[PDB]
């Protein structure tokens, strides 16, 4: 519902969706070749299935195809300084791909907007929605459209006859953070087959050890997992699958 939905917002009104309580799987994202660009900073995407994060924030917007280079830490531009600014120490990455077949119209898709004027550069991870007319003269514009009262936002001319740089592109950026809270979102790791009656090196949710996993009718264990003895020895364990 985030990467490919039927309705995506503009760059100046980028939708922010929180991903939490999720068993994330970035492997299918890596193996997908339908994304034009996929590169991450600070964390290599190869081992994203290992690290665990407390929360995940995803931002989705549609920008010009050539304007994709400005969405990066330490990048100065027009949309970067007026629509979406990223922190220098940003954790996460952007994933973008060509979407001319849906976001471009023969008569021109004019349903998308981008801001060209603001008083000052916006701080990283900030949203500006006010449509006030940017003034450049001495007399107050008072919101009346006319000369020397420039509208901060304009529309893209997304048409199939435009060049690749001018073609519409869909951008989705995911972010990670760590704070004083239990981690909830990360990969599912994996699970091997079970072999019994042979000396193996088992691993049951951190229960590291060796032994022969014979079948035993010990007791009911209505909600317990482990099983202990007079000393601190894990006599019996319950299968998780």
């Amino acid at each position, epitope marked *: 519902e985030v990467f490919n939905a039927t309705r995506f917002a503009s760059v100046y009104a980028w939708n922010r969706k929180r991903i939490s309580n999720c068993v994330a799987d970035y492997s299918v994202l890596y193996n997908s070749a339908s994304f034009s660009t996929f590169k991450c900073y600070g964390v290599s995407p190869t081992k994203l299935n290992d690290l665990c994060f407390t929360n995940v924030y995803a931002d989705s917007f549609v920008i010009r195809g*050539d304007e994709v280079r400005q969405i990066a830490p330490g990048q100065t531009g027009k949309i970067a300084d007026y629509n979406y600014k990223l922190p220098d120490d940003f954790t996460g990455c952007v994933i973008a791909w060509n979407s001319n077949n849906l976001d471009s119209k023969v008569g021109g898709n004019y349903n998308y907007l981008y801001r060209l004027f603001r008083k000052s550069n916006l701080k990283p991870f900030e949203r500006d929605i006010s449509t006030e007319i940017y003034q450049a003269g001495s007399t107050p514009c008072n919101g009346v459209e006319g000369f020397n009262c420039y509208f901060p936002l304009q529309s893209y001319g997304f048409q*199939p*006859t*435009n060049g690749v740089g001018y073609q519409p592109y869909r951008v989705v950026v995911l972010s990670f953070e760590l704070l004083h809270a239990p981690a909830t979102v990360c990969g599912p790791k994996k699970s091997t087959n079970l072999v019994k009656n042979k000396c193996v090196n088992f691993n049951f949710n951190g229960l590291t050890g060796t032994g022969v996993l014979t079948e035993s009718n010990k007791k009911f264990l209505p909600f317990q997992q482990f099983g202990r003895d007079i000393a601190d020895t894990t006599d019996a364990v319950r299968d998780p699958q």
Partner: antibody
Amino acid sequence: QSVEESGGRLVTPGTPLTLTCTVSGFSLSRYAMSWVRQAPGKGLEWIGIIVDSGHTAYASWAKGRFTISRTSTTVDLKMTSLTTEDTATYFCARETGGGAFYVFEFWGPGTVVTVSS
Amino acid sequence: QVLTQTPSSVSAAVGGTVTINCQASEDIYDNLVWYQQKPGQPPKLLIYDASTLAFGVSSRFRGSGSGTHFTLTMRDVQCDDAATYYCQGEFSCSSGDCTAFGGGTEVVVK
């Protein structure tokens, strides 16, 4: 990848004419065809372009008197109501690859269309 | 929408260098290409994206510039470089008339 065209003739003003540009050695449905013209001793001028899908684009100075059509192997353009200042040399240019429009890496021999009495 | 090339004509010796400037009336990022047209010959693509040399062309041709100003300079021009050069760049679609060509310049080597 060889591109050639022909159809240059001497015609009276207002008489329609057809120039056909033929592709060779590549698939037409993958690259975009465009037409440029230059007057004798003058600079280059852009006429129009057709995309691989089939959409058409033109130039404001042309005013919309040209027509670009596509088919199997004949990229042809037709005009109507020629004037006396249209005596020039016409070209059809090929692209490099998918997308990257307005590159014009391959060019034809070039044909001259003259209008006089 | 408007493309301007300066100077219109410029000459230099074989052991010399010249500069050609092509300015765009609108922000085009780095979407600009150059061509060389010998008299009576089809133009040849020299530099695309304003900084990338085309295949099969010499390394003495270099391009630079971004935004609205671009510059192309020839180092150690030979007698084979006597031709005309043009700059072409996209102008969006709803914003400008697709693509327009520059006025061009003539280069003669003594």
